[PDB]
Amino acid sequence: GVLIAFEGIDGSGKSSQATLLKDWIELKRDVYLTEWNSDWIHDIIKEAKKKDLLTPLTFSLIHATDFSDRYERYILPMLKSGFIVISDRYIYTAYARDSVRGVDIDWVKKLYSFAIKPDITFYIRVSPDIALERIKKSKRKIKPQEAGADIFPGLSPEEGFLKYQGLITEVYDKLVKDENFIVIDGTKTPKEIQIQIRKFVGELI
Template structure:
């Protein structure tokens, strides 16, 4: 099964012999993504699969500059979105694709969908965003951890004892009250993700459950992906 990009692949990138599997876990902050990925990763390695991980703002090229830019809050939404795109493609070309070529399972902690959703809310043009990310590789599966806004809020507060500026959408001026802004912003994100789900076909996972219940469902679904990808070997 040859891998494909949504549009043309990045120049110079060959899609032949990408033997691994790209599995994306999407969901809001505090939806439990990193815990689930850590457990999946360990489980897969126990089974004998090599695992590589990727996530946003982790590129060698601009990862640290992006983190700095987020602190300063001085870049326009479009600049931020191009900065994120640079970070994304650096990782796609320099780590995700090489890992897939080597036959790894790549577990991606978020992917282009989060980037598109965040930007759409900030007035990004949908056609522009689709084109920007058209060179992205189509994952073998995308699992979206759906959590109610109430649960997100509870988990965020009990873990960090504070709300994050960006995750509360404070840059949007929805409300001067952080608590209220968080709720309004997360609701908007849900609406965006629902639109994206129809376009890109995520598998929705109910994440309003215990860690182990979610993990169990994820493993069952990942097993199906592995059968498809690795059966020919």
């Protein structure tokens, strides 16, 4: 059982490369792909608390709660069954998104220590500037979570994305050495990068 994690700023190419790589493993091996889509516990609590301003701390516990249920209901059982699990975003998303709002990152690390470290974590390194260009063409609505609208209320969605995804990057780069991140340069072509992905993974043998 091997767990491979993708992380990087939003619009950095995470899911697009995650789905092409699940199309590759699926021909040869058991593979299961997950995104942080969050799940039902985040939905209940957010709706119940739509009126109040909750603290980053409480937001942090809500996401970890919802992740803990996916982790022990799907992720961990499939790694016990031998599957490869591809996580489109893993616990290092929570490290950044909650530590950037003043939650003690070492407390977040302890919070998530119930989770196995990925066999490999692909850090797709892309500038916020270059990555913002792609969501403009995709016709997507720019979610407030993506712009850090809670932290940057005065800015426009566009302007908030640039500043928020920047501090996200600093936390990611801070994790590179301690977390054995492998940094992939997301500047490149989807396929060009994709063949870098398939080489690194294959090494497992």
